[PDB]
């Protein structure tokens, strides 16, 4: 998700 | 000159952070894609709820608008990418081939084909009427963080955390061009200029940089925003002054003068991260959407 960083 | 936006509208009702607000070419709606699964419609002027469309199996990182209006495609992390009937709301096609999740979607002009970016590393590029994948390109060697078809179709423009910008040539899938930086900071997005002469590109060190591509050559950057961490859209806005508009870390949408390069507005509201912004093809409307503490949509408005 783009939405989510890793 | 400055522009002067100001909140008009927000919109409520996705249940996960938001990922992706587009405008209908046709000026009238909105569509936001969410983390919640969801893509919505919304009346472009007035913020109006209009419907919910559904049927991805895992969240939605990226929605885009065919040049007629009438259907939409969204990328999923459910590794598809589905194309649907806007009227309707009913799933037309699933493009299935990616072998992780879709990041990123975008139309040609024609709207026969669409063009997708992923984590599998690869850009793809399908037949809208048949949903079949008609070419898979080995774009990068990182997720592909934004895909971009040119003004007349015959170019893409791929991004990747890899660090780099490439040009392809739409009809042969074959590399046109690679841009590289410096220290290859991972490009987290990409886009073409109306004009098709440059590429706008962010990258995760909280820099937007505008290249003449032709030539490899940075020609302006805008910073004073903070960009470390998403996949923040950027936009040329052209309705009335030359801007650049971006999403900030901050949860502020940053506005610049594209020539001077100069901040000339910041929007204040939004409660979490600005991953998304939009700019209205007619009229000086910017939309506006945050990640999970916010979950919103604003809708701006500016005399120019």
Known sequence: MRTHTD | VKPNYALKFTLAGHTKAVSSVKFSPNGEWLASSSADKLIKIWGAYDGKFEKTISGHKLGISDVAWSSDSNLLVSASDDKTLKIWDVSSGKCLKTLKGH?????????????????????????????????????????????????????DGSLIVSSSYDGLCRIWDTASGQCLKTLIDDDNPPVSFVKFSPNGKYILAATLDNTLKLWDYSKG????????????????????????????????????????????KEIVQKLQGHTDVVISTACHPTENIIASAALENDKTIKLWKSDC
């Open chain 2, 99 to 151: 072998s992780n999740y879709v990041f990123c979607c975008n139309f040609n002009p024609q709207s026969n084909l669409i063009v997708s970016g992923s984590f599998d590393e690869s850009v793809r590029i399908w037949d809208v009427k048949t949903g079949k994948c008609l070419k898979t390109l080995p774009a990068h060697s990182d997720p592909v963080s934004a895909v971009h078809f040119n003004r």
């Open chain 2, 217 to 260: 050559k940075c020609l302006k950057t805008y910073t004073g925003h903070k960009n470390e961490k998403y996949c923040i859209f950027a936009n040329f806005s052209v309705t009335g002054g030359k801007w650049i508009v971006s999403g900030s870390e901050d949860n502020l949408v940053y506005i610049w003068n594209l020539q001077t």
